[model samples]
Target chain A: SGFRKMAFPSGKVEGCMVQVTCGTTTLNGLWLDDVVYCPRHVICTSEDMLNPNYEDLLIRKSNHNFLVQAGNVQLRVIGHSMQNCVLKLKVDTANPKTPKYKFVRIQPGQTFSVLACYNGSPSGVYQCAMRPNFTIKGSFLNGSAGSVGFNIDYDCVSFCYMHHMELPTGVHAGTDLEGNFYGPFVDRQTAQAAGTDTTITVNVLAWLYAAVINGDRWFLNRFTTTLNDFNLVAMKYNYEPLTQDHVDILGPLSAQTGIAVLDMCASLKELLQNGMNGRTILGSALLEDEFTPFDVVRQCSG
Target chain B: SGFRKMAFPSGKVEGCMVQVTCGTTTLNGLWLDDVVYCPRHVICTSEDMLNPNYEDLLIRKSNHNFLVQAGNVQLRVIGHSMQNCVLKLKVDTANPKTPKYKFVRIQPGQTFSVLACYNGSPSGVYQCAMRPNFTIKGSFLNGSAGSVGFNIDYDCVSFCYMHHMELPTGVHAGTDLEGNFYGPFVDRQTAQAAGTDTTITVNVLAWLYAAVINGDRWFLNRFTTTLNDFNLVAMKYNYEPLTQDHVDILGPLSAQTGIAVLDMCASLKELLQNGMNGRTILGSALLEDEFTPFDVVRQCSG
Candidate 1:
């Protein structure tokens, strides 16, 4: 249950620099290079790095050693998919109380993973908020020198709502500028008039119309000429799908309408048949792309 | 505007007796010896027969005029749709308070309509109720002659209702069953006990696991294998879609368990390599149908 510093060559920490210059010979590994390592930079100081005076910071064969320890020290970092980078951790002189790590240059084809140990500084519990990246890596101190790979995935929440209009019963040629209504009435005039007495009635009628057109096989009549094509007959009413608000309002309204529903249907049928054409009555817009006004009107008639 | 009674010849009426005969011989060529007169019965009155009152009822031949005034004392009847027998009408007693008529037989291929003037009887108007056999002769003195062929179309009200169950989310096994529950953890023993706090922890862990499996591409390993024909992954619990009952219960329950969401992706390349597999979970059933669960799971992991 203790922490250990990842070892490097003489004068450098392991996985710390890209190339380490020992006298004249150069040991070029991922983090063993001649890159600038800031003196006041952030360092994830485990208990081992506690109170280490600069004199006690012994440099052995390109490696830096400190006396510190911690428990449950796990470095779970993230990285880009095809990138390679070098990172360095050092003691922060300006803010000794807070320790941090900085990202160095990463090359292509690099991923990340976590390395764990029971030894580290500031011991109790430290949950690492791994930065978001395509790939991640861990220190090589605990194992033979190599790279550990990790990949990241995520999901996003999207928001949307439905909008519609309410048309009058018999009147035609009107508009529902309210943006809160949808209808299968002959027109906005009918909806507006109907709106005066019962907006819920109109909206529910619209929803019912939607159900009729798209719901199932009840109103279809392709073979017999005597039976009128309800779909075609419904073409006269202006129809629209209800908004979220309309759906909410119509549910209770439907229950309240009671047997009056039959009257509404009869009124709708008459209005559709002699009042308006399908396109003008039930516009195709805002409806599911595949559905047409013809479909809606027919369903109602059925 | 009031309730109308349906009429049918099948119904029998009381207080009526009558008869009619046909097929008399024709006279021509100025031969007095060759002329023939056949005996035929017109309609007779039940009241007159009861009174022992012999009243001579005059009848008219289609071509021969006996110089007797018929004077609005005739009854006419018709058939429905081409039938064999029928009943005609006539007035034998013309008293204003007790007018009478008889049922006369109509020959084949002969048809006629009946008309009646409105009088102040408080009955206001009348129409034909039933039809009689076209070819057979019958007495109508007691109002026994059935009327024929008077019909009109009508409108009526009808009702119905429909019920439908929503489509199941996926083919996963555990989705339809009641979910496991988590509880009040009083001590470490209880917390550490198997299944004590595991429900929420498991769900949260599974959520995290999904992130890991999808984020880290854990399912993509080359050696990974699946155990079932189709492996269904449960959809995340969406509170918004839940019913009020579910919200009343699960909302508080959810609060008891500490969980949060995370973001994991970084670049398009990483997305192509890893995020693509995450999509498979949504269509897991279809994927399973297309490929074995083992194969799909393995491919997805990779």
Candidate 2:
């Protein structure tokens, strides 16, 4: 296929030769499902992208400007240390003021999610700027990532939304042999040994949530494992003898939790539901190794 | 109007005279909007509920079996001592097992949200059992309820979804002379003067989040005040000279940030957007007054 300009190319001002290529038609016709190849290291797992929780577009190339399409878009910072995750949020502001709808640098912070949620077409855009050569841990729509970081999950219909939750203040965080951190996770035995109950120990949802953070393929494709934590949770109960098949994800809980055999599977299904419904937006990150060993005490403040 | 049995009054069900006045068609047709009288004490602040954040049905009467309708709903325990917020989450579990899906008390805790999210008809019902005569604080769809409590906001479509965030460990919470409790909110000057920054000080949306808990009228009708924190946040700048009107909520923010002149108002708009889009579901609560003197030391947990 060939491409043409909307109109005759302007001949007066342009001087450099430019190449034009159609990137759309080359995706093996998978663009309809939002599947595309990334030249950079980041990408949504192909089959997993088939899942709605992975709907967020993971940008690989730095200095990239993404076209806003979803009803609600919450810009997030992924895979950088709290120090490096710094960025300034700039929005296309409109008002009766003198600027009359110009870009304004609202504020800068370690994690800022300038949210914009609407329907049809986005009226303007929201952008963020970080320092040069800033690293991105990529995005974790399902949760779990290598190293450590957090997520800003956002979605919208009548308007955009950013739900709030807190992290364990870097305590109970998991790390790989690589010495990098992931989302706050504790072992089944350890958490239980530490006094957490079985239900809290069996986080039907945290598998993928922590998997994408550590970038652990083990967790990403854990259901295939015959003896994962999920199978363990149900194995103890009489509940018809749950097989590994029982642990496999069939689909979402559409009508208030039905057709599920086990609570582990049910909560896992709900987590997947949370991940897909634009409710769970995951961002994988951790701090620099030097700053990694900082604090893990439980403090109280009024 | 009079009533008649659809089955011409079955004789087998003979009992003492019972009154059946169609509770429907009352409230001057406000029920269509989901507004009704709270025979007990809890309710969605009438006008504020015209917004969507308060969509989660608030049942005032205890031992209440609420009719579920929204796509996703997160059940929460409103006002009561934490020791008293106790309830067992029971689900009409469905499985291929022997019982073939019956009511099972899954777990009990201070707060156990057995969520039910779907459309059209409810497939099964999820119930929570608490002791009799439990005190209730109203819901906080916005921020700022009176005393102290939390919220569980849920919404759904294809399936139900729940978002997560953390509370300040019952620290830095507010109280009235009543010594009751509300969500985690700090005084604007106290929060900022404590180095929280002016931006954080003006939680443009916390007004209602806190108001509904203690049932404080001040925060509910705060925007009307000529000199509130919102006005303070904007009045310092030359940005078109904000009137109290600038601090008032115009409507639900549709697109991302656009016409909002102040960051506080923008955040507030986004908060309203959060409140309405099924993102920000508020639950107002606090511990008993004796438990109110909580430790405010910021605990670092690892």
Candidate 3:
């Protein structure tokens, strides 16, 4: 299963090699010296072979197979053979769910390369293998039948623990260098401030305000203008502005808070309208929670 | 795994036998005899064995493991042994989900029988094993040391297809002879009549009456006495009388029908009370569905 030896018609055998030779047929393209050019495989001179296109075609193929750029992963094929060559390259990226494969034809002097975008973070290991045209009698010329293994090393910061956060003005959400939508905030100042106790308190207060304002259907229907008012107040706290999109994503949370508010509002309204034990309106509010801050309005009305 | 032979001390060996013997020169129970009785395994004459205390024990453990009676299944242990021997009978009735096992000591000369109520139908095959006391040794005098096998078979009439039926005066709702709750009608004449097209129309009409009268929550809440009036009308059609208990079981069915009726009734009432285009009241009911029976009532009222 590891490696198989290739047999040649001349009774010579080699485990793995990349080279160029001419029989009755012809070939053309770049040679291993990285400099010499071959119009066709019909003839060759020792002086013409003095300097090849690449000094070592095998090392170049090996380097191309394992090499990764700053923001991309790539698989490359070096066509040093004079005859046209068909190659199959199979690659498995870190995402095990979807492996990719490609069959490419490379003309003698041309090199073919394929690239895929990668987050500038340590993506996991990747594996790739190349195979020359198996139908051709002996086409794996100049070290083309080897596999390369490499790892992607990129740095990233993650903010996954927080369920949801309204990004600050200069901040946008991105994959926390860890390949997830949560963030290691690109701006260090913002990331550091995001962890402070005051910011946490303000965020919680803004959420409570959005929940009660967005959740009360009856209130929203009767007083449509109040939605924008709450949005403006939340924005002042650096919270994400309330919008149809926000409500859609956080509808359940809003409704949960709205239900509690609805019950409290209904109970208070009933007490005020009905006047418990025939007492005056003020009597009911006086009996309610002192921390509710209703006494100021009650005083003015009374 | 099949049966194997057991070796005894005496040269003359038998497969299955029950007897009482003593090497310490003492014994009380019964023994087998080819010709004479052996007192202390010494010697015996025909005269001495003539009146052997009516002690020719034949404790036939007739284990009818699976016998279905008219109303129940029975596992009988026939203790025909002359000497009042203490017998232990263990049985595991194969009601697999709730398998039951019991050990009962049987008195000699008395048949010990265990009974279990069956569904009075051909319940599926059941298996059970019986083991008599082996420590006392030779209790199975004339029989083998293995379990007896039997099966229960009973004829039944199925009443599964009928969805609903009026019960007899005494019998309540339960699985019929075929082991299902849906019934064979208590009255054969009524059962036959229920299948006719006319009965279908009558039942539909009765259901419509019940739905409109019972479903209108506003009318029911405002005028409670109307409920009893509808109940009497339904009872005359041989429907289960609309009692509180009946309503509890069939509440969901009634509610579904009622909602539809409520919508139609409310629309009609609005049309009648307000009319259209400031026209007179007569213009409203005249515009409603022609097939609806309201025209006759409107004609009489207007």
Candidate 4:
């Protein structure tokens, strides 16, 4: 539930984008012209382009291909639900030591740690390092050339990065961030009181407030509700599912604190009542030593 | 998610009593004193009356045997966190035809549809029929004779039977009850308006109230908040996780109406934020057609 967890797809990934494209032609096949107008920033669905109207009738005859690209943004393409459709995800140029085609076909219900960027300072990790220019393609629509009757969910999303230590075990963990250390990122930003104890793990302010680490910082998905997504990616290390362990680690990241694992408990309460119908679960763990200011912040969350 | 699931362990089997007897000092392991206070109606833990309370402090030197009998009661024993422990779960005489284990070593983390009694009607199913006269025994505790240390979780609590068809698929599902009709069971009870519609799937009285079905009926985890328990066991049929489908079938069973899936959605939101760190998640699915009263009930929840 930790490594490679994707950041929750925001916007109709929740508040979605509408791609209105009308292809008029008789070619009517995947490459022949099935695709109407394809959007790049947000992922699209067969339902989106199908725009069923007067032109919906003509879409069956037109064949076209569109690109879902990540020019330089370290974005990943995620497949939600795909019916009667196939995808070809592009491999970034720096992906492998050797080489392969620029893009590869993506089948339904599959998982891989293939990212579209370069790893920087972190040794054993290769998540989105400053984002990769991702690219995507789909099959022909409205005709037999493909599963014209198909429907699917696919998206290209971005991520942020950070590092931390789990408590009781002093184990290391990381939270794959959507943007950067401060602002300019997609998901959330980090804050810290300057000149706080950077070498120590225990500090009162850091507990209820922020920790004063040397070159790094912590973040909590307190405000952002996509916690499952946060832990999977951000929680780059510790793997114990929610309980006291998880509350220990992720809690410090947020000074916006009140309840430790605000959403964690929110979602926990939700799961007991619901059941895993259309959900992808994740977990947590934490640290101690000099990890306190991170404490009150979470204790508040706790 | 909801198809097949088991119930939770009650007590140590909670609020239980012990049936103890110190056999000769030489019976040797298992049947031996490794078996202390063999509780009949309730379950026991390796940590319990290992007699170690005193005898536990002396055991390894002496030998004795004991029995964990299921004189009779609807119950189930589960391995909480059994370590250095092994149990011979007796196959009630009413159990298998050819026969294997009058007693079987139930490994840790495993589950079984064990019984101590006979399965009579409702055909093709056998869930603690009238509470099998369940029986049990275990490895030695507190000594070199066994792992020297062990712990497990077991119980014999509820059950309330019911029979209903998933209107959507017209599939059959059963909630193996602990007691008899209308329930004198452990989990929950049933209520309904007499002389209500029995032929069609749709009904008003049954929706907000209950249906007067011919034989068995519907049951929501009404009183039992361990919903994950309810869905898996009671939902012995449909298997979607919490969605409109689950709410559809289990909804009408409760005139105890208010929210459709009171806890279903609760758990859904929980898993999202918490991740399955220490959770044994389950799912749900349901039907339509002659399926509501189960309606207003859910349209409200939906």
Provide C-alpha RMSD values for all models, in order: 42.5, 29.7, 38.8, 29.0
Error of 4 at B106 (Å): 19
Cα lDDT of model 1 by residue, B156-254, tens digit = 111000000111210001000011111111111111222211011122222222333333233332232121200112112111111233223323222
RMSD of 3: 38.8
What lDDT tens digits, residue by residue, belong to model 2 across residues A1-302? 00000011011101101111112211000011111111111223344323322123323212233221212332222221111111111223211112111112211111211111112111111111111112211211111121122111221111111111112211122222222222332221122211221222122232232222222222132232233545554445311233443234322321112323244344443343343343332212211111000000000000
Q: Deviation in angstroms for B148 in model 1?
A: 99
Q: What is the interface RMSD of each candidate, in Å?
A: 49.3, 32.1, 48.5, 23.2
lDDT of 1 at B301: 32
Interface RMSD of 1: 49.3
Q: TM-score of B chain for each model?
A: 0.14, 0.16, 0.21, 0.19
Q: What is the lDDT for B162 in model 4? A: 25
Prediction 3 global C-alpha lDDT: 0.22
Real interface contacts reproduced by model 3, as a fraction: 0.00
**Per-model DockQ against the true two-chain complex:** 0.01, 0.01, 0.01, 0.01
